Structure formats: structure tokens, C-alpha cells
Scaffold this active site. Structure first.
Site, PDB file in Angstrom:
ATOM      1  N   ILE A  72       0.804  -1.209   0.000  1.00 29.13           N
ATOM      2  CA  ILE A  72       0.000   0.000   0.000  1.00 29.13           C
ATOM      3  C   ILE A  72       0.846   1.272   0.000  1.00 29.13           C
ATOM      4  CG2 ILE A  72      -1.694   1.341   1.283  1.00 29.13           C
ATOM      5  CD1 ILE A  72      -2.897  -1.259   2.258  1.00 29.13           C
ATOM      6  N   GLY A  78       3.848   4.587   5.865  1.00 26.55           N
ATOM      7  CA  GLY A  78       3.406   5.568   6.835  1.00 26.55           C
ATOM      8  C   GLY A  78       4.599   6.246   7.481  1.00 26.55           C
ATOM      9  N   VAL A 115       6.368   0.421   6.643  1.00 26.88           N
ATOM     10  CA  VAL A 115       5.634   0.091   5.431  1.00 26.88           C
ATOM     11  C   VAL A 115       4.240  -0.443   5.742  1.00 26.88           C
ATOM     12  CG1 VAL A 115       5.654  -1.170   3.266  1.00 26.88           C
ATOM     13  CG2 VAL A 115       7.801  -0.540   4.359  1.00 26.88           C
ATOM     14  N   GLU A 146      -8.466  -2.443   9.612  1.00 29.88           N
ATOM     15  CA  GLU A 146      -9.492  -2.819   8.653  1.00 29.88           C
ATOM     16  C   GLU A 146      -9.031  -2.115   7.378  1.00 29.88           C
ATOM     17  OE1 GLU A 146     -13.406  -0.969   8.841  1.00 29.88           O
ATOM     18  OE2 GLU A 146     -12.620   0.614  10.127  1.00 29.88           O
ATOM     19  N   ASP A 198      -1.036  14.057  13.186  1.00 31.08           N
ATOM     20  CA  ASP A 198      -0.455  14.025  11.839  1.00 31.08           C
ATOM     21  C   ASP A 198      -1.481  13.710  10.773  1.00 31.08           C
ATOM     22  OD1 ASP A 198       1.654  14.241   9.984  1.00 31.08           O
ATOM     23  OD2 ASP A 198       2.022  12.080  10.031  1.00 31.08           O
TER      24      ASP A 198
HETATM   25  C1  LIG Z   1      -4.682   3.627   0.309  1.00 27.70           C
HETATM   26  C2  LIG Z   1      -5.742   2.602   0.367  1.00 27.70           C
HETATM   27  C3  LIG Z   1      -5.429   1.175   0.765  1.00 27.70           C
HETATM   28  N1  LIG Z   1      -6.199   0.762   1.934  1.00 27.70           N
HETATM   29  C4  LIG Z   1      -5.849   1.147   3.209  1.00 27.70           C
HETATM   30  N2  LIG Z   1      -6.583   0.770   4.276  1.00 27.70           N
HETATM   31  C5  LIG Z   1      -6.070   1.260   5.423  1.00 27.70           C
HETATM   32  N3  LIG Z   1      -6.671   0.997   6.604  1.00 27.70           N
HETATM   33  C6  LIG Z   1      -4.911   2.040   5.247  1.00 27.70           C
HETATM   34  C7  LIG Z   1      -4.178   2.686   6.221  1.00 27.70           C
HETATM   35  O1  LIG Z   1      -4.556   2.618   7.527  1.00 27.70           O
HETATM   36  C8  LIG Z   1      -2.960   3.514   5.904  1.00 27.70           C
HETATM   37  C9  LIG Z   1      -2.520   4.532   6.802  1.00 27.70           C
HETATM   38  C10 LIG Z   1      -1.369   5.307   6.475  1.00 27.70           C
HETATM   39  C11 LIG Z   1      -0.676   5.088   5.304  1.00 27.70           C
HETATM   40  C12 LIG Z   1      -1.073   4.114   4.412  1.00 27.70           C
HETATM   41  N4  LIG Z   1      -2.217   3.318   4.703  1.00 27.70           N
HETATM   42  S1  LIG Z   1      -4.487   2.121   3.581  1.00 27.70           S
END
Ligand SMILES: C=CCNc1nc(N)c(C(=O)c2ccccn2)s1
Length: 293
Positions: A10, A13, A17, A78, A124
Site C-alpha cells: 500500500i 506511513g 511500510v 481494517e 499528523d
Molecule cells: C490507500 C488505500 C489502501 N487501503 C488502506 N486501508 C487502510 N486501513 C490504510 C491505512 O490505515 C494507511 C494509513 C497510512 C498510510 C497508508 N495506509 S491504507
């Protein structure tokens, strides 16, 4: 991990990763975050983080599990469909319709109001950690307190300063719920204009961009500002710019709400609870967005 089959990556953060993973066991898809740890593991972090699992709300991405195994740290969340950053980029030609911008802000404020009523700050907030689904909901994810503030990702990544509140840039050592309202105000303006409000490329550039737009703060508008850690009397003195130049074509209720979200003084900044009663939300609805997955 082991009980997971990393589907993709994905991204990354502020701690490590983030992977899209399928739980071989249950088969349910989740967002798995590997936390970067060379030196002892935090005792308080895992305990505090574990407390976050008991934070349930429709506008908060549910933290399903904190896994500390093989002396490694994984956070299982989730999985949502897309982030606001990609959605805004996808809506750059047309722009997000106002009814949807309004619905997203209303929901995010509910999420913040809930977190803040529970003494939990995000610190943040950014488009990347605001997640939306096909049903028109938006949720706050990737929450800072439990595991300090990392100067850089586990592998040299450029942290975004665009949404950082002024008190933080001025070296305030104590944060307040007000820092989340500021970041959201910045995101709100960005959905409207389809351009980042304060795109600084450094802490000082970030601070001066805010100053050039809202006027250099002084003791009148922000009591105590001149005594803040990184304040310098040598800061240039910029006059405040007309607010109608800032977020056109946002209507007056919207501009009124935004100005209250962007007050320099954290104490004068509107709370999430109060913002929800703002007349801007009088005609709020819940449209469904057009998502390209
Ligand atoms: C970008 C969509 C993919 N699905 C995701 N579902 C999530 N719950 C995500 C995150 O909690 C997250 C938080 C910070 C940086 C990258 N991803 S990402």
C-alpha cells in the site's frame, strides 16, 4: 508476516511500510503496518497502542490487532478502498462536488470529536491517512503519542509539513486537540481549491507560507506567541491576506468555518464538537462518491 499473504504494498506511513494483506486463516483482507524498531522496544507504546483497539467509531479506521511477535511490531487495520489523496488527484479536473466535500468534513469532525472526547489526538492528519469507501464514508487512520515522533521513516522518506499546526512549527512541546482541527482545516481548503493551502518544503518555509497568508502572528491575535521556543523577533511582518482570496468559491458559511479552524491561537481555534454545530452543516447530506478501484 506468517499468518498473512502480502498481496501488495500500500505504501509507507510515518512508522513503517503498509501492506495490503490477506489473512490466510480467516481470508479477510486487512491493511498491515510494520513498525520500525537496534535499540530496546517501547513498553508504554504497546500498552498505549493496545488501548487504541478499544476506539470504535464509524469515522475511525478500526485497529483490529497489535501483534508483538518475534520481537517485531505489526498493527492490523481494517482495509479501506482508497485514500483522500488519490481521490483528490482523481477529482482534479472536476473537483470534488461541494456536497461530498461537506459530507467528508462533517464525518471527519465527528471522528475527531470522538477521539478528542476520549483524550486521543492524531497529530499528523493528512489526505494519505484519510480513507474512504464506496458507501461515502471517510475514516481517520494511521494515528503519534504512544511512539514519539520519528525524524524520518525507517527508510528516508520526505515527511509532509503542509498540514502541521503553527504552534508545532514554533516548537510548542505540548500538543492539544487544536492541532488536529488545523490540519483538517488545511485539508478542507485543499478539497475546495484542489491545491494544498500551505505547501511548505521546510519547517521555516511552512511557517512563512502560513504567515504570508494569515499574517504574521503577534501578541494581539496570539497571546504568548512571542515566547514560543522557536519564535524569532526577526520573523518578517506579513499582513493578513483577504480571506476571500484564500478559498474561492467556498461560500461564506464555509469560509467562516475555515477561518475558525485556522485561528493562530490553539485556544481560540474551534473544537470539533463546536464545528459540527456550525451553520455550514445545516444542509449536510451523505453523497456517494464515484470511486475508480
Ligand atoms: C490507500 C488505500 C489502501 N487501503 C488502506 N486501508 C487502510 N486501513 C490504510 C491505512 O490505515 C494507511 C494509513 C497510512 C498510510 C497508508 N495506509 S491504507
Amino acid at each position: 508476516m506468517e499468518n498473512f499473504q502480502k498481496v501488495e504494498k500500500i505504501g509507507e506511513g510515518t512508522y513503517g511500510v503498509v501492506y495490503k494483506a490477506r489473512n490466510k486463516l480467516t481470508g479477510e483482507v486487512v491493511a498491515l503496518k510494520k513498525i520500525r524498531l537496534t535499540e530496546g522496544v517501547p513498553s508504554t507504546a504497546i500498552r498505549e497502542i493496545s488501548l487504541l483497539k478499544e476506539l470504535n467509531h464509524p469515522n475511525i479506521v478500526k485497529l483490529l490487532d497489535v501483534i508483538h511477535t518475534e520481537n517485531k511490531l505489526y498493527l492490523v487495520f481494517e482495509f479501506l478502498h482508497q485514500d483522500l489523496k488519490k481521490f483528490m488527484d482523481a477529482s482534479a479536473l472536476t473537483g470534488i462536488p461541494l456536497p461530498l466535500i461537506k459530507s467528508y468534513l462533517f464525518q471527519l469532525l465527528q471522528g475527531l470529536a470522538f477521539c478528542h472526547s476520549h483524550r486521543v489526538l492524531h497529530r499528523d492528519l493528512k489526505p494519505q491517512n484519510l480513507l474512504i469507501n464506496t458507501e461515502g464514508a471517510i475514516k481517520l487512520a494511521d494515528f503519534a503519542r504512544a511512539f514519539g515522533v520519528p525524524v524520518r521513516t525507517y527508510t528516508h522518506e520526505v515527511v509532509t509539513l503542509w498540514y502541521r499546526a503553527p504552534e508545532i512549527l514554533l516548537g510548542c512541546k505540548y500538543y492539544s486537540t487544536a492541532v488536529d482541527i488545523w490540519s483538517l482545516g488545511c485539508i478542507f481548503a485543499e478539497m475546495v481549491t484542489r491545491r494544498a493551502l500551505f505547501p511548505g518544503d521546510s519547517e521555516i518555509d511552512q511557517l512563512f507560507r502560513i504567515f504570508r497568508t494569515l499574517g504574521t502572528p503577534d501578541e494581539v491575535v496570539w497571546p504568548g506567541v512571542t515566547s514560543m521556543p522557536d519564535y524569532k523577533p526577526s520573523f518578517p511582518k506579513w499582513a493578513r491576506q483577504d480571506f476571500s482570496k484564500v478559498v474561492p468559491p467556498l461560500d461564506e458559511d464555509g469560509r467562516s468555518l475555515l477561518s475558525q479552524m485556522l485561528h493562530y491561537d490553539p485556544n481560540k481555534r474551534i473544537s470539533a464538537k463546536a464545528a459540527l454545530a456550525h451553520p455550514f452543516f445545516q444542509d449536510v447530506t451523505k453523497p456517494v462518491p464515484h470511486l475508480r478501484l
